[PDB]
From a paper:
In H. pylori, Csd6 is one of the cell shape-determining proteins that play key roles in alteration of cross-linking or by trimming of peptidoglycan muropeptides. Csd6 is also involved in deglycosylation of the flagellar protein FlaA. A Csd6 monomer has a three-domain architecture consisting of the N-terminal domain (NTD; Val-13–Asn-56), the middle l,d-CPase domain (Lys-67–Glu-202), and the C-terminal nuclear transport factor 2-like domain (NTF2-like domain; Thr-209–Lys-330). Mass analyses using the synthetic muramyl peptides indicate that Csd6 functions only as the l,d-carboxypeptidase (l,d-CPase) and not as the l,d-transpeptidase (l,d-TPase).
To provide a structural basis of understanding the molecular function, the crystal structures of Csd6 have been determined, both in the ligand-free state (“Csd6-unbound”) and in the d-Ala-bound state (“Csd6-Ala”). Refined models of both structures are essentially identical to each other with an r.m.s. deviation of 0.17 Å for 632 eq Cα positions. In the case of Csd6-unbound structure, two monomers in the ASU were similar to each other with an r.m.s. deviation of 0.64 Å for 316 Cα atom pairs, except for the N-terminal residues (Leu-15–Asp-41) showing r.m.s. deviations greater than 1.0 Å with a maximum Cα deviation (7.6 Å) at Leu-15. The amino acid residues with the largest deviation encompass the entire helix αA and the N-terminal half of αB. In the crystal of Csd6, two possible models of the dimer could be identified. The dimer model I has a buried surface area of 1,080 Å2 per monomer (6.7% of the monomer surface area) at the interface, as analyzed by the PISA server. The dimer model II has a buried surface area of 726 Å2 (4.5% of the monomer surface area). After direct excitation leakage and buffer background corrections, the distance between Cy3 and Cy5 dipoles in the dye-labeled Csd6 dimer is estimated to be 107 Å from the corrected FRET efficiency (Ecorr ≈0.03), using Ro (Förster distance) of 60 Å for the Cy3 and Cy5 pair. In the crystal structure of Csd6-unbound, the distance between sulfur atoms of two Cys-176 residues is 96 and 66 Å in dimer models I and II, respectively. This result unambiguously favors model I, supporting the assignment of dimer model I in the crystal as the dimer in solution.
Author numbering:
A (entry chain A), B (entry chain B): 15 to 330
Write the structure that this text describes.
């Protein structure tokens, strides 16, 4: 079953039964692993799935090195790479002042340009501690990707956790970036890419979870949640399930849509198969066919694949 | 590839902008000649485009003969053919009692069975005079496809305009038809088939016209109409245009959907490239977001292609 068959089937449905049945068919594709497997088959998927154009930094703490990529239609283009300086402590960053460069997936939130000359041309600010770090109660702050001292001093072999590279290369990255946000994937010894099978399982599950949510299927929705689940505000599984039971019993109608979806393999010290999933969510709920609630938000999930099953370990 | 890209566009649109925008995108394909060119490329298109399953008699006045077809996904299955008795007058039927079998595209409206023995096992009633005949002021009635005398008489060489075939075969067609309406194409010496280019032009135009109508684009809508236009109720081009300018100035919201579209080459004296278009139409209009008018009707168009341009010459 291929893309041409699916297009023909969409149009046949549209001409014969109209628009509502088209939506139901499109939903069935989105919930279908094989549909994603086909879309992904010739794409560069090692660093994840990215719907829109994005920029990716990849840091190897061990070498140490930093690479920079552009990703468009899920095809990678390597811009450059170099050696880097990183923190002195091996493994996870878990505490303020532990001198460790964090392992995981981070976002570059801003550029700083009026800094001590030690930081070089600029500093890209990472969002350590990210949601995952925050729900694990890891402490610390101020992890940046920056340059080398402007005076030309080279008197350190390690930072206190920041990632530092040469200024000309750093400037060249900034010119490619043009003020766009970047992801940063940082790993330690060896990187374990997301496979096409894993991305296919996550994306199909993602849409199944959405539609179980929207239609108020409490049992199906709850099965996507890992027993260890933690919500962004600290709520754990039992209270979460209690609450959702009540909410779902109200049987309100909802429409939910996910866009700008990225799914990114998440390096971690236990080498669990973890992924960070981030997307825009359009959410609408109705009471007696009157719109009673709407929101547009940025959602974040952390998902594990274990025992060949997808589960949600954290959600904002 | 293209089908991969086209599908991806639809899937992204569905989640980013909604099912309504998906419908508009499918509509843009239906308005595109190259879309139809591709869609028709391996279809049996000589007798026209038939969206759903349909049945077709083809009568050659000159032979004389009658063929019967089943048409499913626009592939012809020929059920049978045989010799036939037809009217003695060559050329057009224009008048009550002129003994001519009419030339053009007709519809079988009903089956009669309580007949005089002369007429055989049954009569399929054709709709002579059709809309075209009627707007051309042609008169007469009772043009049937029927059998041979039940008392075994086989005297006559010609009917008074009906089409007569052997009773065993006629019953066979009836059992295949099973109460369904059928089309009849009748032509005189040589049949000049609808081509794939003609059909693709007519179909893309049909959907362009629908969009111009529904979105209220007066100038683009009026461009499809031939100067010689006659509406089913006699109204001519200038009065039609005047009335439409008024209606379009109201800028009412309108939703229009077509289904079971058939486009059938229309044989004619002058061998002009004329076609009969017939479809079901669901029409709704609104006033300040409230439904003010709805209808479900069978629409009929007669269309000429001349100097590579599609025009409407008659509409019901």
């Amino acid at each position: 079953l291929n893309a041409s068959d699916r297009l023909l089937e969409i149009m046949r449905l549209y001409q014969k039964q109209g628009l509502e049945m088209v939506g139901q068919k499109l939903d069935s594709y989105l919930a279908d692993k094989s549909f994603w497997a086909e879309e992904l088959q010739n794409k560069d998927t090692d660093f994840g799935y990215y719907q829109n154009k994005q920029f990716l930094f990849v840091a190897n703490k061990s070498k140490p090195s930093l690479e920079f990529y552009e990703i468009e239609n899920n095809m990678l283009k390597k811009i450059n790479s170099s050696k880097a300086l990183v923190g002195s402590k091996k493994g996870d960053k878990t505490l303020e002042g532990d001198l460790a460069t964090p392992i995981g997936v981070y976002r570059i939130t801003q550029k700083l340009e009026r800094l001590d000359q030690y930081y070089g041309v600029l500093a890209f600010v990472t969002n350590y501690p990210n949601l995952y770090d925050t729900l694990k109660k890891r402490t610390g702050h101020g992890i940046w990707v920056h340059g080398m001292p402007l005076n030309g001093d080279r008197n350190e072999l390690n930072t206190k956790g920041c990632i530092a590279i040469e200024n000309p290369l750093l400037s060249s990255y900034d010119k490619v970036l043009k003020g766009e946000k970047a992801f940063l994937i940082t790993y330690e010894d060896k990187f374990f890419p997301s496979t096409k099978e894993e991305l296919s399982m996550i994306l199909s599950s993602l849409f199944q979870w959405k539609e179980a949510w929207a239609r108020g299927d409490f049992e199906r929705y709850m099965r996507f949640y890992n027993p260890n689940f933690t919500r962004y505000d600290g709520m754990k599984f039992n209270a979460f399930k209690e609450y959702k039971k009540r909410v779902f019993a109200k049987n309100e109608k909802k429409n939910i849509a996910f866009s700008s979806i990225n799914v990114i393999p998440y390096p971690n010290s236990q080498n669990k198969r973890l992924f960070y999933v981030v997307f825009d969510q359009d959410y609408k709920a109705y009471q007696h066919n009157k719109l009673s609630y709407s929101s547009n938000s940025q959602k974040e999930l952390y998902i594990e694949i274990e025992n060949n099953q997808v589960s949600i370990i954290m959600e904002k």
